[model samples]
Target: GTILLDLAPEDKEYQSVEEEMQSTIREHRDGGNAGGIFNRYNVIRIQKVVNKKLRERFCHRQKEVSEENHNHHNERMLFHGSPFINAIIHKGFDERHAYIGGMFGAGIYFAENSSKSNQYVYGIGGGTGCPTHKDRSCYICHRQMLFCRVTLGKSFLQFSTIKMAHAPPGHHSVIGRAYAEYVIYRGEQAYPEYLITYQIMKPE
Candidate 1:
C-alpha cells in the first residue's frame, strides 16, 4: 500500500517538521514587501509519508556520500513546493519535469527556506496529477508542499545554473549561496518526509 500516512493534527510524530513550517511563518516578514507572499501563509496540516523504496535508495546514496565526506550523510530537511503534491507523496521526487526549467536545468530542487518553495505552491489534490486541463479547482486557495530529507554529502557551490547530472566533478551535491537552495542530480537522494498544506491568512 502507499506509504502516505495522514497524521492526526495532534499526533506527536513528525511534529518537528511541522514546527519547522510554523517557524518559517514567523521568520518571513510580510511587513510590506511587494513580493512577500509566503509571510501571510500559515500551515494547516502535515502528513508523514514513508516511501520505503525511495528511502532505501537514499540510504544507499548516503552511504556512498558519507564515505566521501568522512562518514557524514550531510542530510537536511528541505522544502519543496509543487502542484504534484499527491504524486510526490506516493512515489517521491522525479527530476524529469523540473519546475524551474531553463533556470535550474534538470535536477531535483530543494530549498532551505519554506517560503522559497511556497512560491510554487498550488492545490493539486484529487490525485489528478497536475491537471491543468480538467479541474477548475486544481489551483485553488490552499496550497500543498513537501518537506524532504536530502542527502547532500560534499557540496559544491555554484553561482549559476547548468544542465547537470549527478554531483559536480569532485562533490556529492550542488548548492547555491543563500537562496539556500540545492539541486540533487540523483532523484533518490531525497525522501519525501512530510507533506504540508497551508493557507493564506486573511489581511488585517
Candidate 2:
C-alpha cells in the first residue's frame, strides 16, 4: 500500500486544486485576451467575477439538481439562475475547496442549441451516501452516483466532440485516488476501511 498511498496522498488533491484553478485562470486570460486590448487585464477580473458568481450559484443549484420532478431543473440554467458546471469538457471550479464542495452533487449544464438562451452542457457529481463512511450526501450529489448531462440543438453527443477530462498521461490513474483522498481530507469524515469506490463520468 505504500506505493498507492504515495500516489494519492491527501496533500496531492489539495495541490491539484491549486493547479487546476491556476490553469482555469490562465486559460481564461489567454482566451479572453485574443480580441481586444482592454481584455488583457479586465478579462481576468471579469473571468474571476463570473467564476465566483458561478460557484456561488452551484450551492443553490445543487438543491434543484437533487430535487426530483422539478420543472425548473430541466430548464437550461445560467450563471445567475443556477450553477454553470462545465463549458466544453472542464468543470467550473475555484481555488477554494469549499467552492468545489458546493458542486459536489449538482448537474453541469451545456447549450443544446446555439440559439438557446441558457448553458446547455452539464455534469452532476455523485452523492454522499453510497460511500457511507461519509454518511450524508450533499444536495448536488444524488443517488445516481455518476452522471453528467449534455444537451445540444439536436444530437449533442454526436455533434460535439469534447474529450473527457483526466489527469495528464503520466498520472492518469492517480487522479481518482487523489480525488478520494481529497474528499476524505475535506470532509474530515471516516477514511474508507477499504476501497470506497466512486466513478467520474464523461458526457457522451
Which candidate wins on TM-score?
Answer: 1
List runs of model 1 lying over 4 Å from the truth: 8-15, 25-38, 99-104, 123-140
Q: Which residues of candidate 2, in runs, are more than 4 Å off?
A: 1-14, 19-57, 68-204
Weakest lDDT window of 10 consecutive positions for candidate 1: 28-37
Q: On residues 1-204, what C-alpha lDDT tens digit does candidate 2 reach at each position?
A: 111122233455434422332232222223322211110111111111123343344545444333432423332211211223222113333222232322122122212111111111122121223233432322222211111121111111212222223212222111111011111111111111111112211223
- Give the count of colliding residue pairs in each prediction: 0, 17
lDDT of 2: 0.21
lDDT of 1 by residue, 6-89 (tens): 777667665667667656653333332211333455667777777677777778878888889998888988988777778876
